[PDB]
Design a protein around this ligand. Structure first.
Ligand SMILES: O=C(O)c1c(CN2C(=O)Cc3ccc(Cl)cc32)ccc2c1OCO2
Ligand SMILES: O=C(O)c1c(CN2C(=O)Cc3ccc(Cl)cc32)ccc2c1OCO2
Lengths: 149, 149
C-alpha cells in the first residue's frame, strides 16, 4: 500500500484537472492540462515518480491504460501500471467525493488567482495540509518512512 | 533544518531550469520555464509548498527576494522568505557542483526525449533515486517524518 497511487481526471472551466491520489494517505498532486492525452498523463507520472516512490498506479480509464506513451513512462520510471477498475465498489463514490471536495476548495480560493492552475495548486496545498489528528501530508510521509525503516 | 529549501536557477538550451533543493537531504524538484520571472518563481513555490512542508526558502537572487509576487506566494503558503547569501562560503561551490551534476544527468537522458522538460524530469528522478547507501528521496522522507514525531 505505501507505493500505490490512483489517477483521477475531473473537469472545470472547460479544462481538465489531472489528479494522483496516494491511496493510503489521501495526499494528492494535481495539474491543469488542456485535455487528457497519453502524453500529458505520461509526463505527469514521470514528475510524480521523481518525487515520491510510486510503485503501482491505478490508471483512471482504459485509454491511459492502453496508451503506449503512458506505458513507456511507466516502464521508464519503474512503475507497475494497473487498471483502476474498482473491484472494491467503495472506489467510485470515494473518487467522486474527492472531486467534489477539490472543486469546493477551488471555488473558495478562486477569486485569489487569475489562472485556474494557480487556484488548483492552492487547493492541493489546503487539501494536503488539512488536519482530520494528522494531515494527508503528514500521513504520507509517516507511511513511506515506516516502510523504509 | 527539515523545512529549509534553497532556490537555484541554471540555464540550458537557451531555457531556464528552476530548482529547489531540500538542504538537509539533497532532494530536488525542478521545472523548465521560458525565463525566470517573479510570477514563475511564485507559482513554483506554491507547488512545492503544497507537496512538502516548506518553512523557509533561501531565494536564489535579489530580484526574486524583492518580487512582490514572490513575497505574496510566500505569505499565502506560510513560508519565510530569506536571502540566499552564502554566509557559509561552501554554498556557492555546492550549488555549482549540483548544477554541473544535474546537467550531466540531463545530457545522459537527453536522447530519450524530444523536449527539454522531459529530460529535466528524468534527471530529477535519477538524482533523487541515486543511492550513495540511502537516496535523497529516502533522506528527505526520514528527516521530515522524524520531525513530525
Ligand atoms: O478529501 C479527499 O481527498 C477525499 C478522499 C481522498 N482519499 C483518501 O483519503 C483515501 C483515498 C483512496 C482512494 C481515493 Cl480515489 C481517494 C482517497 C476520499 C473521499 C473524500 C475526500 O474528500 C471527501 O470525500
Ligand atoms: O547531487 C546534488 O544535488 C549535489 C548537491 C546537493 N546538496 C546536498 O546533498 C545537500 C545540499 C545543500 C545545499 C545545496 Cl545548494 C545542495 C545540496 C550538492 C553538491 C553536489 C551535488 O552533486 C555534486 O555536487
Amino acid at each position: 500500500s505505501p507505493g500505490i497511487w490512483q489517477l483521477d481526471c475531473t473537469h472545470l472551466e472547460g479544462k481538465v484537472i489531472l489528479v494522483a491520489v496516494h491511496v493510503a494517505s489521501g495526499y494528492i498532486e494535481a495539474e491543469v492540462i488542456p485535455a487528457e492525452t497519453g502524453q500529458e498523463t505520461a509526463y505527469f507520472l514521470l514528475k510524480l515518480a521523481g518525487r515520491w516512490p510510486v510503485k503501482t498506479v491505478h490508471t483512471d480509464n482504459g485509454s491511459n491504460f492502453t496508451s503506449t506513451t503512458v506505458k513507456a513512462a511507466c516502464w521508464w520510471a519503474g512503475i507497475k501500471q494497473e487498471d483502476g477498475i474498482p473491484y472494491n465498489p467503495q472506489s467510485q463514490g470515494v473518487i467522486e467525493s474527492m472531486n467534489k471536495e477539490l472543486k469546493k476548495i477551488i471555488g473558495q480560493v478562486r477569486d485569489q488567482a487569475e489562472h485556474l492552475k494557480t487556484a488548483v495548486q492552492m487547493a492541493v496545498f489546503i487539501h494536503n495540509h488539512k488536519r482530520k489528528g494528522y494531515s494527508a501530508g503528514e500521513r504520507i510521509v509517516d507511511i513511506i518512512a515506516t516502510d523504509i525503516q
